[PDB]
């Protein structure tokens, strides 16, 4: 029962134990913005219809 209530942390991606909420929020905010490929693909639409 310990494993069932402790999922999404026992089997997740690595996040450091003592991470301040500010740093976590900054990390989350970066990935909510376009990736380098997204910007280039956005502009190429006008060229190749």
């Amino acid at each position: 029962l310990s494993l069932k209530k402790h999922n999404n942390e026992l089997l997740g991606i690595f996040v450091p134990c003592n991470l301040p909420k500010t740093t976590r929020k900054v990390a989350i905010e970066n990935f909510n913005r376009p990736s380098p490929d997204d910007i280039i693909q956005s502009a190429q639409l006008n060229a190749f219809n």
Binding site: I40, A43, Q44, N46, A47, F48
Partner: protein, 282 residues
């Protein structure tokens, strides 16, 4: 398709195409039939554009192959297409300059093969002069590639030309700027004259035109040996006062540094240096 007279501003179209490609983050390829013009156009584009990387691909050199703007020869593009290069997928515009010089036999097959092998996502820009066979090239391209192409032509030369005749220390205008022959002037030219140049002929012209503020001159002589004799006949004539000579000397000294020390003493280099200090060259 642009077919305008010479010195009308055809290179403005290519610059705008390059700017459009830079704005859209795509690639452009520039091609000329003659390898001599590739270096000059490379230098001109490098001077003109500062935010756009320029590259060159010839049979002798290869500079910045990964740049967004590439200048190459037609055969280089043919080999690249045969190899199936991955950069072709990003190319938006291909520009062919001096199309009217491709009507040869060796220059004709490669141009047609390159046109045939190009993919369907590439647009075309064509520049040349006024030639009798203009609509056929555009029709063939638009039929083979199934693309819409517009043929644009200019009415007349932006700058007008006149034809004159020189005889016995004066100049007779015989054709005006409207390309209308003047019979009376030719008759007067026939009357006043009633073989080859003499030793006192080119001095008789380098002074008449100098005082008329029409100095920049190009003389066409159809002989390698006669040009040197004509240049040597001009003695005691200069155009550099005190600083132009020093600047030309510095430019020559810096330029020929790439040669070896014993290769800078050749008689041709010395004669060219001596002539260039006075504003005369062959």
């Amino acid at each position: 398709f642009v077919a305008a007279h010479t010195s009308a501003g055809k290179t403005v179209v290519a610059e705008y195409a390059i700017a459009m490609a830079h704005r859209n983050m795509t690639k452009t390829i520039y091609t000329s039939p003659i390898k001599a013009l590739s270096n000059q156009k490379f230098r001109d584009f490098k001077e003109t554009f500062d935010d756009v990387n320029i590259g060159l691909i010839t049979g002798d050199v290869q500079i910045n192959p990964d740049a967004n703007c590439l200048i190459m020869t037609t055969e280089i593009l043919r080999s690249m297409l045969y190899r199936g290069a991955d950069l072709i997928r990003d190319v938006e515009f291909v520009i062919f300059d001096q199309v009217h010089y491709v009507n040869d036999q060796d220059r004709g097959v490669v141009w047609e093969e390159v046109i045939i092998m190009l993919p369907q996502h590439v647009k075309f820009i064509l520049l040349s002069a006024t030639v009798p066979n203009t609509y056929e090239f555009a029709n063939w391209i638009g039929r083979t590639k199934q693309k819409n192409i517009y043929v644009i032509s200019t009415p007349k030369r932006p700058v007008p030309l006149e034809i004159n005749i020189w005889a016995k220390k004066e100049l007779i205008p015989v054709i005006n700027q409207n390309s209308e022959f003047l019979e009376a002037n030719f008759r007067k030219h026939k009357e006043i004259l009633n073989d080859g140049p003499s030793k006192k002929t080119w001095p008789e012209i380098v002074n008449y035109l100098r005082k008329r503020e029409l100095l920049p001159m190009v003389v066409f002589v159809f002989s390698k040996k006669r040009c040197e004799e004509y240049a040597d006949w001009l003695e005691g004539i200069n155009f550099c006062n005190n600083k132009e000579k020093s600047q030309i000397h510095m430019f020559i000294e810096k330029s020929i540094t790439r040669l070896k020390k014993e290769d800078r003493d050749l008689p041709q280099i010395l004669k060219t240096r001596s002539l260039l200090e006075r504003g005369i060259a062959v």
